Design a protein around this ligand. Structure first.
Ligand SMILES: [Zn+2]
Length: 415
């Protein structure tokens, strides 16, 4: 009689239970759910507002739904950029032409533009799980989707999470199988009796199973998400999770434009910037060259952000951009290792919108290439040229730029 209505509500309530509150439930008017005839329409919806950074327990919800259904199904969850928010939409079967993300353990990031969407179903999730050798024991490794709502964009990351205490989870599955006497069914029937213990269990999957991921150079920083850091060294090329990176754990558009028009003041701050233009003047007056580089204020933004972020010993090289005109810039890192804090990557991406930032390695030197793909008030070229004449430059600095321009004259950004 009423049982069927109760079975469906118990499901949706347990789903809403495990979804963090920042992703607000926004379901409409839903019908009665028949386990033997699961619906094909959308069964739940959760919404994340702009600037939200939260994780969705995609795998747990999928397996909960598969456990509820008394027939074969392939739970599918669609992740959509609404233009003002991220929208998670759940289904028992993937709609006809719904998208499925092409992700793996190592390539796990997805960036959605405005109005676009991606998705994933339990079948694809399981395939990714068995290809990466992930632990398949129930509750040892479940996938979540970390979302960083950064309108007009939505950043996603498909990550496998695990328990802080695996032994505490092996014992839970031991008590669940005892009461019952796949193995997931034992857990879901047991945990159905204690919503509090179910919440505590899902909220306990908070240990990333893959804290670092390899990348291939050249690496476009546009493939990162807001909490990704980047490490380049003799240990390889890796993306990290800002929260779980030991190095990491250890200014809007206005302030950037304000820094460009106020560069003449605190001339020492970008002494290293002007010294590059001197060294570039030799090879082939310097005033028309200085004007061209200042016509690309994003290049100054990058240099300003790098040093505000602690990367004080960087060097910048300017090369004519054959395609877009003007100049591209190489940020040369010192030494044989570099770590870009996740906050720094976020900053340089926002500051240089319209420019591609790509990490390279050339002649034992790590670098970023900044190539062109809101008006900034122009400054007086002559005002900067005159300050450049009065500035003093040590020979070591000028020789450094001599060696660097000679070293990178043969460097060709793959693009
Ligand atoms: Zn880091």
């Amino acid at each position: 009689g009423s049982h069927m209505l109760e079975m469906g509500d118990n499901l949706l309530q347990r789903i809403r239970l495990v979804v963090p509150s920042a992703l607000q439930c926004c379901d409409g008017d839903l019908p009665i759910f028949d386990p033997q005839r699961p619906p094909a329409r959308c069964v739940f919806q959760f919404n994340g507002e702009d600037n939200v950074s939260e994780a969705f327990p995609v795998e747990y919800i999928m397996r909960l739904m598969a456990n509820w259904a008394q027939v074969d199904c392939d739970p599918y969850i669609k992740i959509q950029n609404t233009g003002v928010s991220v929208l998670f939409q759940g289904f028992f079967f993937r709609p006809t032409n719904a998208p499925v993300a092409e992700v793996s353990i190592d390539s796990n990031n997805v960036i959605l533009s405005s109005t676009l969407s991606t998705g994933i179903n339990l079948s694809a999730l399981e395939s990714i799980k068995r290809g990466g050798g992930i632990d398949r024991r129930p509750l040892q490794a479940l996938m979540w989707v970390n979302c960083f709502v950064r309108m007009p964009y939505v950043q996603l990351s498909f990550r496998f999470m695990g328990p802080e205490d695996p032994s505490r989870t092996i014992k839970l599955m031991a008590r669940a199988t005892d009461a019952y006497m796949s193995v997931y069914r034992h857990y879901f029937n047991y945990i159905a009796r204690s919503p509090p213990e179910e919440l505590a269990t899902v909220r306990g999957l908070i240990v990333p199973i893959i804290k670092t991921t390899p990348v291939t150079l050249p690496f476009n920083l546009g493939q990162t998400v807001a909490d990704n850091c980047l490490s380049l060294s003799g240990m390889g090329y890796h993306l990290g999770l800002g929260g779980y990176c030991p190095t990491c754990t250890a200014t809007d558009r206005a302030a950037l434009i304000l820094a460009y028009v106020q560069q003449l003041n605190n001339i020492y701050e970008y002494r290293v910037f002007l010294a590059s233009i001197l060294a570039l003047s030799d090879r082939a007056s310097a005033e028309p060259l200085l004007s061209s580089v200042l016509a690309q204020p994003e290049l100054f933004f990058m240099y300003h952000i790098m040093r505000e972020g602690g990367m004080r010993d960087i060097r910048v090289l300017f090369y004519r951009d054959g395609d877009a005109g003007g100049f591209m810039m190489y940020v040369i890192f010192p030494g044989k290792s570099v770590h870009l804090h996740y906050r720094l990557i976020d900053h340089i991406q926002a500051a240089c919108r319209g420019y591609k930032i790509v990490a390279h390695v050339w002649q034992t030197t790590f670098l970023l290439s900044v190539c062109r793909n809101t008006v900034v008030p122009s400054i007086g070229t002559s005002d900067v040229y005159c300050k450049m004449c009065d500035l003093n430059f040590d020979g070591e600095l000028l020789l450094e730029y001599k060696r660097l321009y000679a070293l990178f004259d043969d460097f060709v950004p793959p693009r």
